[PDB]
Design an enzyme around this catalytic site. Structure first.
Site, PDB file in Angstrom:
ATOM      1  N   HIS A  35       0.863  -1.224   0.000  1.00  0.00           N
ATOM      2  CA  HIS A  35       0.000   0.000   0.000  1.00  0.00           C
ATOM      3  C   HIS A  35       0.874   1.241   0.000  1.00  0.00           C
ATOM      4  CE1 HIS A  35       0.175  -1.626   4.104  1.00  0.00           C
ATOM      5  NE2 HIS A  35       0.532  -0.414   4.419  1.00  0.00           N
ATOM      6  N   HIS A  83       3.108   8.734   0.371  1.00  0.00           N
ATOM      7  CA  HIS A  83       1.774   8.684  -0.249  1.00  0.00           C
ATOM      8  C   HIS A  83       1.859   9.610  -1.464  1.00  0.00           C
ATOM      9  CE1 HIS A  83      -0.110   6.821   3.265  1.00  0.00           C
ATOM     10  NE2 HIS A  83       0.845   7.461   3.834  1.00  0.00           N
TER      11      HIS A  83
HETATM   12 ZN    ZN Z   1       1.913   7.576   5.850  1.00  0.00          ZN
END
Ligand code: ZN
Length: 255
Positions: free
Chosen positions: A60, A92
């Site tokens: 992820h 991210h």
């Molecule tokens: Zn993070």
């Protein structure tokens, strides 16, 4: 859980009901509403003795792990009480330069967001710290697209070796000081982890000043895979959570 149409952010609450809790992260930082608190101390980052071990693709995001057996890399000062030890950093990013960050400033989205995770040594380990309200301290750093970040190249160069889910690579003598903005002015608020189990144990410290990275740098990010080796290729992009309701909480500024 993931960031797809069937397992995305909107579906997390089914497994992790705290998803709709009272102190969820990330959030939109309304700068006119943020309260300037003169009682906040400067942040104190001691990273000269940090010790990176390795990097991994957990399906992820990509994490750079650090040795937290001793106070080698620590955070203190600011709105914090006591010492917090650096355990890992996670990133991210989006599919386009126009999205990627988790936290937003007056609804503005940055290309990516870097999280430096620290636990309270009062609790003895990371597993215990996450069961506490003041358990963790995450320093959030925004990345805008412009000039290359010399300091970030070592990470870019190793991504090829951790393409798929579960891969990991030795990653020593990587100094995180290379990813810090010039200014340490910040925003602070009580929130949670941005990914499941989304525990409400975090004291967020978001730096005002973003770091710039080149396009070819962030482009290498977008070549990561969500999937395991030998499976259908699904690009790791848009691994960010949408801003959550402030709900009474207040954002204080050190500036
Ligand atoms: Zn993070």
């Amino acid at each position: 859980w993931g960031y797809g149409k069937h397992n995305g952010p909107e579906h997390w609450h089914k497994d992790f009901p705290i998803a709709k809790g009272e102190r969820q992260s990330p959030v939109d930082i309304d700068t006119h509403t943020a309260k300037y608190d003169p009682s906040l101390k400067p942040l104190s980052v001691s990273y000269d003795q940090a010790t990176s071990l390795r990097i991994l693709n957990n399906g992820h995001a990509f994490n750079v792990e650090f040795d937290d057996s001793q106070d080698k890399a620590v955070l203190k000062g600011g709105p914090l009480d006591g010492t917090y030890r650096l355990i890992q950093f996670c990133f991210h990013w989006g599919s386009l330069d126009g999205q990627g960050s988790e936290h937003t400033v007056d609804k503005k989205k940055y290309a990516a967001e870097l999280h430096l995770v620290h636990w309270n040594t009062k609790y003895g380990d990371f597993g215990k710290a996450v069961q506490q309200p003041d358990g963790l301290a995450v320093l959030g750093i925004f990345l805008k697209v412009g000039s290359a970040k010399p300091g970030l190249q070592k990470v870019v160069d190793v991504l090829d070796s951790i393409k798929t889910k579960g891969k990991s690579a030795d990653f020593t003598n990587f100094d995180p000081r290379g990813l810090l903005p010039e200014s340490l002015d910040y925003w602070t608020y009580p929130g949670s982890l941005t990914t499941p189990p989304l525990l409400e144990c975090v004291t967020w410290i978001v730096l005002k000043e973003p770091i710039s990275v080149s396009s070819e740098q962030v482009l290498k990010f977008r070549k990561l895979n969500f999937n395991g080796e030998g499976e259908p290729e699904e690009l790791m992009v848009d691994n960010w959570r949408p801003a959550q309701p402030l709900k009474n909480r207040q954002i204080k500024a050190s500036f």
